[PDB]
């Protein structure tokens, strides 16, 4: 087994010395995950600033900036965002299956 290193990348040129602020770059992603992920990350009470930006349409890149308050790194805020979006999808999938039976 080998993990892919080209997908998520931490832009060290923008990362806070430690540890709250960072800019992440994801390949083969756009508005689909982008707007959904920044929405979930913004629900975190520790996230100070969050937004997504696509550098250019021709290049397959997605940038997401997470600036938090203390006691939480930007990496943790991203990991919480992904973990919550997965659970959010489970809720959608569970409610849809139930209403199909309810018909």
């Amino acid at each position: 087994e080998e993990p892919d290193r080209e997908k998520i990348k931490l832009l060290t040129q923008a990362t806070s010395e430690d540890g709250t602020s960072a800019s992440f770059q994801i390949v083969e992603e756009d508005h689909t995950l982008g707007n959904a992920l920044r929405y979930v990350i913004m629900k975190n009470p520790d996230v100070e600033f969050c937004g997504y930006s696509i550098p250019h349409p021709s290049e397959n890149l997605l940038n997401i900036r997470i600036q938090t308050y203390g006691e939480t790194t930007a990496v943790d805020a991203l990991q919480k965002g992904l973990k919550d979006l997965m659970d959010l999808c489970d809720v959608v999938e569970s409610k849809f299956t139930e209403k199909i039976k309810s018909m």
Binding site: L11, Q13, A14, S16, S21, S23, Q25, R38, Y39, M42, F49, C50, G51, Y52, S53, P55, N63, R65, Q67
Partner: protein
């Protein structure tokens, strides 16, 4: 160009940024042309309000610290213009925040009293929306036109 002396020249003498003003009259030949002008009249309008989520998105959408757009290595944000009931940011505040992150921190904010192409009469009774006002790098009055 195939050498560093020719590179330095194309980056410091003949480069686009050093050609903002034409030597014919010393007037600008660089600026935004159509959608951007119509977008600005709407974005900087009094009626344009934005939530924390919306406001921060518009900031990072145009300013990316990783692409070296910032001067503070952290995106600084103004407090909302409306605190209670709901926290809301004005359209003009986005223009203040963009300048606050692109202009040097060591220097004070821009102070300018300019005018608009759109007369006050169009914006209703007692509006001062024609007077473009910048006090310490903050858009406090007037929309932004082709002007």
């Amino acid at each position: 160009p195939q050498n560093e002396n020719a590179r330095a020249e194309a980056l410091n003498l003949a480069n686009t940024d050093s050609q903002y003003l034409t030597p014919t009259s010393g007037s600008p030949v660089r600026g935004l042309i159509q959608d951007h002008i119509s977008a600005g009249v709407w974005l900087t309008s009094k009626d344009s309000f934005f939530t924390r989520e919306q406001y921060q998105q518009y900031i990072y959408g145009c300013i990316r610290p990783e692409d070296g757009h910032t001067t503070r290595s952290k995106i600084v944000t103004l407090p909302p213009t409306i605190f209670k009931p709901y926290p809301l940011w004005t359209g003009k505040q986005i223009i203040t925040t963009v300048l606050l992150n692109v202009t040097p921190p060591d220097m004070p904010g821009i102070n300018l009293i300019s005018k608009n192409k759109i007369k006050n009469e169009y914006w209703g009774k007692g509006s001062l929306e024609n007077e473009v006002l910048f006090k310490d790098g903050a858009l406090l009055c007037g929309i932004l036109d082709k002007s």
